[PDB]
């Protein structure tokens with residue numbers, strides 16, 4: 001017997017912390033849903049040439065970060081360090097791009113071999129967004145408006161700055177960049193043009209932006225994206241315009257918990273089901289299942305493994321149950337169930353056929 | 365151009381939709397039982413899988429995707445989730461003298477020959493409960509699954525196979541007999557006393573719940589950490605290679621992996637097999653369109669107007685899916701794009717409308733369009749959509 005630890009730089013998100021993640025995620029997804037964007041799920045592993053061909057060879061990602069390995073069949077495989085390439089790839093592969101428009105988003109883990117700190121993980125997660133078929137600066141502005149809406153939704157708008165600039169400058173890129181700035185101004189979105197802003201990836205053409213934070217609630221940048229009109233062709237498909245971005249969920253989760261500790265998730269248990277005595281378990285479990293039928297949306301946990309009423313009532317407190325449906329030998333024979341409000345301590349005996357209604361009132 | 369690694373799929377917008385509807389329902393039912401989500405790393409030290417799953421098992425022998433890290437360490441993309449789960453639990457002190465009712469969803473990697481229900485990158489939704497011994501929690505897990513089947517309406521196409529493989533002793537006693545017969549040419553008979561009680565109590569609980577099962581004495585799982593209770597939910601619609609959900613006890617794994625002995629039980633399900641079984645048995649488990657309202661808008665400097673009205677309508681109509689057309693196009697092109705997405709209504713925004721402060725609300729299903737003041741469109745849409 002020995003202990004195996006987690007690969008350094010790879011994290012486990014425990015029960016308490018995932019509850020926050022679930023809230024933040026759903027909010028993000030909900031807003032994406034309101035703009036008409038569809039979800040696409042892509043492979044964690046792709047062939048190495050994809051990342052070499054797309055990201056660029058003199059990039060520090062390709063140079064020193066990819067987690068690459070050789071498959072049983074000699075093929076070199078690489079665990080995705082970002083997600084646009086795979087997207088484009090899947091796009092070209094199923095023929096979703098040629099003379100079509102797609103507004104997609106994706107979420108999942110990315111991998112990069114890096115020396116961990118505040119916001120640098122070896123296994124990290126991105127919410128990414130990509131649109132195909134639209135060139136003008138209009139769509140460029142829609143994406144920024146979308147990010148903007150996310151900040152407001154999460155209550156962190158006063159902690160993210162927007163950086164902007166074009167790496168085309170040539171005439172066309174100027175008109176296009178100007179139009180973008182102008183849409184932003186109209187939207188009342190506050191920006192800062194930065195001449196030295198260039199992304200670490202070699203596939204961006206005109207537009208390049210970045211939302212940043214000072215709380216280092218991220219690693220500075222929290223979201224970053226840009227346009228890449230040539231990547232579809234470069235990877236073997238007919239030329240199509242494209243733009244998107246991806247955000248560091250860990251950074252985001254960090255920024256929110258910092259800007260507003262007033263954020264919380266619903267507790268896990270609403271009702272705890274205490275039961276003790278000879279042959280009560282089947283009764284208790286049968287009741288629990290009925291309460292589940294009648295009370296859709298209630299989080300009810302059935303104690304298991306015996307324990308006296310004192311221990312069980314304490315388990316109810318551990319979980320944060322507000323109500324406790326109790327049931328011993330008597331209740332079972334009499335066809336009742338003791339409903340105990342753990343907040344006021346007021347318990348009452350109710351006929352089982354009426355417990356659902358009672359709980360309903362106690363929970364609001 | 366590059367293709368995808370064989371045995372690893374892409375889930376497109378169309379099907380993605382069916383996955384989220386199925387996943388939600390799953391997560392919702394897990395929530396109604398008080399189970400918490402836990403998230404674990406996709407890669408772990410190879411020795412964990414070797415230690416946990418067993419050396420002479422098919423997974424370890426020929427399916428894992430191992431490789432070396434820059435520092436010499438052996439890394440393995442997980443082929444299952446229980447090991448990572450137990451590991452993370454011992455590592456953060458979540459199991460000692462504690463109870464947990466966890467679940468997780470994610471990818472699992474196995475190097476197998478791709479078939480109808482076998483892929484190299486597959487997804488599991490699993491459940492692990494630590495700290496409870498008796499057959500009660502075992503029965504709960506089986507009921508949890510039954511609720512899912514009903515929720516998804518495939519209850520009629522999934523059977524339950526059950527079996528007890530007793531304790532270490534019984535299995536080490538069954539060897540002599542088994543092996544002896546093997547050299548030459550039943551498990552239930554070497555089952556220690558304690559294991560027979562446990563399995564009977566378990567069975568006694570399922571009958572009462574009205575859950576139908578079938579004891580299968582040749583049912584052993586393909587992993588080596590399991591102890592008493594063992595089960596699999598199987599479908600004849602071959603929506604899978606057969607088995608859609610499978611699990612069992614594994615009381616000794618937490619200690620073996622270097623922690624204090626705590627009991628544990630869990631299971632994991634193949635989402636692909638499930639999604640397949642559902643689309644099969646439930647012919648039209650239709651998901652809703654990605655677009656409700658499409659925003660037409662052509663004319664001089666109309667876009668800032670359109671994008672602005674669009675932002676307002678999102679604030680007023682939370683829940684609606686509204687897509688703002690982009691890249692120009694004549695009303696004819698745009699109305700077509702609306703059809704493409706399946707928008708039921710279109711709010712048109714020409715040059716007049718900008719000036720007159722109106723917007724035309726076009727009911728795509730009946731063609732009857734009307735001009736409404738912008739302060740009243742939200743209310744107008746609200747009605748058209750019900």
Ligand SMILES: Nc1ncnc2c1ncn2[C@@H]1O[C@H](COP(=O)([O-])OC(=O)[C@@H]([NH3+])Cc2c[nH]cn2)[C@@H](O)[C@H]1O
Nearest residue numbers: 082084119120121124221222224225226244245246248
């Ligand atoms: N090791 C890490 N640990 C934690 N968070 C990290 C790590 N590396 C990057 N991030 C997060 O991911 C964001 C985007 O990463 P990137 O700068 O490599 O660009 C891109 O990925 C492009 N794919 C953006 C894109 C998508 N579509 C178009 N352009 C960063 O701003 C940061 O929040």
Ligand SMILES: Nc1ncnc2c1ncn2[C@@H]1O[C@H](COP(=O)([O-])OC(=O)[C@@H]([NH3+])Cc2c[nH]cn2)[C@@H](O)[C@H]1O
Nearest residue numbers: 444481482483486607608609610611612630631632634
């Ligand atoms: N290549 C594949 N493609 C698609 N689906 C697949 C593939 N391999 C396995 N599955 C799914 O994973 C389930 C569990 O099969 P398993 O025998 O690998 O055991 C286990 O995973 C145990 N760890 C379950 C467990 C957790 N806790 C206790 N027992 C199968 O019933 C099937 O639905």
